[PDB]
Amino acid sequence: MEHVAFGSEDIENTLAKMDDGQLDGLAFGAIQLDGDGNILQYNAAQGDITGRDPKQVIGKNFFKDVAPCTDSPEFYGKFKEGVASGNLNTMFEYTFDYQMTPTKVKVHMKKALSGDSYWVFVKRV
Ligand SMILES: *C(=O)/C=C/c1ccc(O)cc1
């Protein structure tokens, strides 16, 4: 288990060290996206929240294919503004309801420390 709190101020520094197995040790869902929204990493906690099988969604586009209910100004619009700006740090509640029981969550999106990739962190509320 990786001991990291959801919403921590320096979360991007702490998760910069994590391979897929380490990410699977977190208490919350974690997705790493490229600037187009393609999934680079998707952890076990996230799959428990959403029902998706992690290795099956890596490589898919989060907004176009996996999570169309997030293709909205309230989620994807924030993401793409942050990619365009090169800076992103926002936390909001959302409901995931595509081919699943509607599930209310808290989402924290934050630009990764290095390069140009973006974290999406999720926990139940
Ligand atoms: C709405 O379509 C939400 C879907 C969803 C959210 C998060 C995931 O990791 C997978 C699917």
Swiss-Prot record:
Transmembrane segments: none annotated. It comes from the Bacteria. InterPro entries: PAS, PAS-like_dom_sf, PAS_fold, PYP. It holds the Pfam family PAS. Monomer. Photoactive blue light protein. Probably functions as a photoreceptor for a negative phototaxis response. This is Photoactive yellow protein. It comes from Halorhodospira halophila. The lineage of its organism: Bacteria, Pseudomonadati, Pseudomonadota, Gammaproteobacteria, Chromatiales.
